[PDB]
Amino acid sequence: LVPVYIYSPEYVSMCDSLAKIPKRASMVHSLIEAYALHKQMRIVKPKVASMEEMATFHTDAYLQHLQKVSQEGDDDHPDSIEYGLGYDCPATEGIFDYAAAIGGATITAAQCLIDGMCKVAINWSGGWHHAKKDEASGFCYLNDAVLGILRLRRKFERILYVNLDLHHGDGVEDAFSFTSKVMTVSLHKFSPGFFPGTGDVSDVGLGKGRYYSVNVPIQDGIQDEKYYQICESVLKEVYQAFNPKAVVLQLGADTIAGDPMCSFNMTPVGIGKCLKYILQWQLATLILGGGGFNLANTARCWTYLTGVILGKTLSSEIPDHEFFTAYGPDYVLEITPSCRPDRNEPHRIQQILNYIKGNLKHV
């Protein structure tokens, strides 16, 4: 009944070495610890993913290439562009082993859920949902979300993947495009030129998986109330049509006001309402992180959401801890939205919802 928290000091230190989010894992854990939330969770040390586990999704050739350039951090290997390495996904020294640790952490969370150790298991350093079977993508090297879902498939007949990251969860949607055992639901920014460029409302999966992918394309500037209205409407319909047995929930904080991507205009309170809606289903739930490039705000967000999971109200004041000065000059947990416009028009949102309802009738 007590949530599982996937953590070790060695794991956090590996996650701190990811090129686009240095030190973020330490900031997140440190703030959770500062609020003493870890004392209310069951701390579980992650196992490292084996090659055999990784190869149930990723190809041998891709895993072999990642292992090779990882050994010394060869970010100048001529073959890396075929495998998606380059600017977004540099060959950081050690990245194969770091990604294997994150994959293993998500698999460990899934296994805890299978065993009935907990109803909620958390890996805030997971959520790297853009990686493809044979390609790094979008700061993702191994798709730990896919690996977690594939572990959950041992027991849970139907799995719902819910993505609330700013970016379309395209690697997970692709992996399960042709199956009805896994439904993917993604709320994300959709605008030509905006990464990864996929996930329109008309993208519904393929073959035997047709209508088992759901995409909610959203424009810049969305705030908590409207986002929750959308999320609740879609998940209400999804729950009734698909009857999931387990949920994997990706809560990337790059939607939050203050992110340098400056696209959505959310606060952790809005995301928290979405999370509460899912938690009241009382299903095995695997919680993942993802994007989030204002590091202090990402720690504020995931710490707040950890409190939501535990049913706790957190003090507004940021407690003293290793990274206290990163939270100045006001040192509070709450985040204020920016004063810019919401570009989501009510008629468009309604039509997207009606389109999705129409698709789900087939499910």
């Binding site: 700061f139 030129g193 905006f194």
Partner: peptide
């Protein structure tokens, strides 16, 4: 391919 980032 798109750039993220």
């Amino acid at each position: 391919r798109h750039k993220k980032x």
